[model samples]
Target: IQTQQLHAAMADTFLEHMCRLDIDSPPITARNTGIICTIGPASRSVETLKEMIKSGMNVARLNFSHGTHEYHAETIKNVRTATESFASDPILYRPVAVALDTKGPEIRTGLAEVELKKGATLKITLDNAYMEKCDENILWLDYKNICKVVEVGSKIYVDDGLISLQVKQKGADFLVTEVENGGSLGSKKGVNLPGAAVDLPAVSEKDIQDLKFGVEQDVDMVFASFIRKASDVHEVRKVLGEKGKNIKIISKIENHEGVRRFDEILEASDGIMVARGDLGIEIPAEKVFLAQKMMIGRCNRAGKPVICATQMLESMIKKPRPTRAEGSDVANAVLDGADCIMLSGETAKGDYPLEAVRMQHLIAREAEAAIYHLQLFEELRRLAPITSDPTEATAVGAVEASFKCCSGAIIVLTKSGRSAHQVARYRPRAPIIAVTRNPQTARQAHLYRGIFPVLCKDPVQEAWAEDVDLRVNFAMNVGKARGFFKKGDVVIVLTGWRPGSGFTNTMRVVPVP
Candidate 1:
């Protein structure tokens, strides 16, 4: 091949390279970015969850804002029931991480469905008696100090700014507003108090209760909502306490204030979610993409996983096909270097939940192909430390070697999953099969980019070298079965110098056995 042709091939899709190597059928390319689906009324069954897993849902999310503990327990049970069998199967079973999302302090419209016309005047009563029941002309808001915070002509948005109200008159405890936008105002929709510095607890009492329940259920991660400062992250940590210490906290950046304190939150969070729904309402819509880009880039540089979320495939909620803009939205998120992309109502209440998941999978795969891996890897390495710990140095060396030799895949043996995380930080062109003994480690590994985690269920061997050989051979068999590589193909084997976590100081390049 000419130099240009070789460079072109280097930048080509994974399938193109595999096909050039004459690998049969070029086994389907798996997405590097994770997929998170919210489980609710639409997709909570064992059968449906299994299909969703097959469709490429890496993490199952339970929105604690809506569901009861009993309700979420059933969903968690179903998720676990669905994933257990897959782990038993070596070539296919991938442990899916389950995340619980806290419903942080926020304003909301009270329970009642009423059609408020566009030209009609409506009363947002602060009466506690109307909390659960409201009529067409009058409705209740959860925030009691609505009148004090707003003047006449101030705007209030509901349901992600879809329904709009302009305050006309302020009473002692109520606000008479004109319905600027008309719709069927449903129960408990989010009320966006734009331009209002409303004082509310960082972690509400409800959030504390929900977080405790999450600890008891042993959820892998928490998508913490409305995190404005590092203190909020610490507050959640306090609520999670000693029991939920292991649970990863992914702070959701939902508003302008959170964006202003982004660095502090990043320092404290295990990951970040660019929650665009409330965020767009808080800031300008045009600026949301800019924030998305900036946040993803920062997380990439920080080596923290970042997720792009909300309305990724919103149209797919009802339609089998997503809009053109939706297609590009998903693709662009992958291009922006997001470690994960999420679906909210698309999976939770959408008519085509499975199709939505599959669409995201397909779009992400294509986007992954288009990325300039050489530039991305070089940029990551350029900003990295010149020297580091043995484990970190080994990870860099292994990935660099893989790139030079065009190795098919890098298979890593990890105990606590740190080695895999290091490899992921460098962002190798090829996929990583992170083999680990711990089920929790295996599941959480999905949160990172380019990591395909497989749980090793084989009985432990007494001899250290014997166990090493077992994991090596197991990873090889899995690689072949999963089409990561075949016999005679070169693969990088990463292992620990000692028989425990953080000892992954050794790297070896060997052909698939």
Candidate 2:
């Protein structure tokens, strides 16, 4: 396509669709941002999981940091039951993406908590002998080879760098360290390996087990925790081998090393999770919000989904309502371009898990309504490779086509889901209903912004156009049931000219029946 023509494509598509937006109560548009809920003891059973599906959870995140596989195995089953079986009626059936988060390169926890003073000489050891015992002078960490891995004069920050330590001397399993800066250090604090080699097993043995288990369980994604570099992602790929290659990996960025080599890690990861808990611990608390925005913005530029996570609604774990600060955090994270936001302990262990999910849903809806969508879309297009992929270019045109005509819905027929994925990047105000035959594609569709995937139950038809029409009709029925588009509304339809994936050059505008 000529640059002049491409320029017109962008120019002619501006402002008309929104200009025709019906101001009917302002919330007729579906929420484009995704919500991920962690499965735990509180929201563990199939019934609670069923309730949560209706309560606005798009992804079910199983935190491997705490639960045994025996426990997680059952939760995976419950999620499947809730999604695939809770409603025999296809209209109510929600295909929630089940994702497992591996606890990567964990740190030490003491048998008991203690306080250390500044200027104190603290004895740190890796021996199990000291694990059950520690005091102001001595502390035991879990990594047995820390002495061999670190050098004297190296920096070691604990409890989110609140209490700083430095290695003064070292031995086989023990080291003599000084509290360079100090405060109360207790359980669940993050630790860095002095950034010396910057290599710890991102694909730990436990992670290997969990990854393989998901391959058999047919989970759609894995959120790898504590990834530092591109090589770390390669290690995970290596462990997945041939059998487990289908799962998407969302890397959790929560360390200084991750922040340092973000571009490298970002290229390697299928998506990013800005995990602010330990992310807060590793970097300055003042810098955490900026870091979140940086990564979210970077991901949007690259067209990969990014999640803003950890402590989004922290107080909602105990209280029935979200704090004003937490609400603003959720709102800004949505406006900051995160495709998804997560609930960690709030949904996993909180007393009011359902309420928290509802609050996040409402907050995201408001934020979505307030987005300067025209500027966002213009920037997203300008940032793309001007000679974009044909599918991407088609997607952009289709979104603008919908906007220009005030489309009630954009129905896309996809096999690999690339067409649907591209339209989502444009963030059209109209709802996107992606119809595909592949079940995995439908489940994984939740990770992207503004995509509502519909799985076609019919068998493949040798007449390719017939199948395309079939899926389009199926998606239209779904839109009708949910009132996505009422009678006589315009809808922009996209489909491949050929039989399979990657041939999404066709776009047709259809009026609702």
Candidate 3:
């Protein structure tokens, strides 16, 4: 084939494999808040993932804690294979994004399994690696800095605070403790030092290796767990280098320090994840709800995607339906302006994975329908300062114009997907038509709600009107093909003169051609 023809073929092939959905259901009309589902033993199969996609899963998460490199590599390959197979049908054509969730610096109890009764006294040995089974008298810890951080009378919560221990004496290598509460302890249960700054690096050696593997797999985003400060995010980015420049870094806030450094972390990272499980353990349980609200609002104001994760539909792990409170929790996250709500064990190891997703979809649709967009707009504007950048102004204006004119769709021509992200941040009433020349960027837009990715050819040369004209024609064609709009409909078109150079600085309202 000729070079030009080959490029076109490649683009088409990429779109065919990446931008298609493979579910029997019709496109959900009420979906506005995106859903991310973790891929695990229960939902790793192509069929299960397809059902999840149809049920409203916009992103698939690959947790780095459990699976091997080979196992995760196969899962990634299977995800692409399934998307390609699903894209074969033109009717189902929404791409699903993949995220690599890194296991950050984690402090865990040792390999020894032990059962302790209430009021039992145990000794926690600071060992790098422990393998022997522990009796009631002794327990092993994986963290080396345990003794250095804790002192006499320091409290330690084990297994998510289910088993509490109060330090009576601190030795060179162990902490003699009286267990306030005890339970069946298993291997690798998490250790939480409530107030002690356990001197652990933010990213572990295992995390770096896993991140490198994720970059090699070309994942869409990386979730950096236990992010305490901006430097943690920078460390991950530095390791990513050029090969993973476009990949998004999502800082998972799961500790008191991360909450304290929230704004700095938010500014440094591409996005944030309210990792409530560990966070709840680190701080007062009553504060987690407020923290979630605060973090979501902050991220929305900063124009970054923030995912509200952990235990949204936890009870569905074995049950067919979510509890009423769980349903409300998911709805409230959407109403609170969270860009996305995540499902962890519900879809990862749950017996009713598909049902959980369907339930979440229903709750999100109902909540979005009731969302006061005008109030949401005002709230976001209050958080975001007025900027002097022409491109930022233009991007924001396009959404405002579309909202005011009641346009059927907002067409955005973005080479880097920045313009699309900006438009999505506003949460416009109209659907966003994101026309892009890059396939990877188009796939990335999948995680952003209301943005529909359409693959198009790049212009031969740069011309202000000519470039937009090409995009306009492509946008209109796609709109008509998808039954979004007709000739008489007014649509907002956003684009930049020089593609991919900077932010979008030009926009126009045009009738559908």
The digit string of per-residue lDDT tens for model 1 on 74-101 reads 9999999998867667667878989998
- Across 359-464, the per-residue lDDT of candidate 2 in tens digits comes to 9888887766656666787798888787657788789999889778868788998777778988987888778888987888888888988888888777877687
Candidate 3 lDDT, 1-513, residue by residue in tens: 121112222233434422332222233253667788899889989898777777777788999977799988887887777676666543345677789988777777766335777677788865544445544566677677676778888888887678888888876777888888877887777788887755777878988899999889989889999899999999999888899999988899998888999999998998889999989888989999999999988887777888899999999998997788898899899878887889999989889999988988887766654455655665666666688977678877887787688677888878778878888888776778888777777777766666777766455546756766776687787777667777988999887656455757778898887
TM-score of each: 0.93, 0.87, 0.87
Off by over 4 Å in 3: 1-30, 89-91, 112-114, 127-132, 382-388, 456-488, 498-500, 511-513
Ranking by TM-score: 1, 2, 3
Best by TM-score: 1
Q: Please, what is the whole-model Cα lDDT of each candidate in the order they appear? A: 0.84, 0.80, 0.78
In model 1, which range of ten residues has the least summed lDDT?
18-27
Candidate 2 differs from the real structure by a C-alpha RMSD in angstroms, to one decimal, of 5.4
Model 3: lDDT to the true structure? 0.78
Compare candidates 1 and 3 on lDDT and give the better one: 1
Model 3 clash pairs are none
Local lDDT at 96 for model 3 = 73
> Residue 13 of model 1: what lDDT?
64
Taking the candidates one at a time, how many backbone clashes does each contain? Answer: 0, 0, 0
Candidate 3 lands at a TM-score of: 0.87
Candidate 1 residues lying further than 4 Å off, grouped into runs, are 1-28
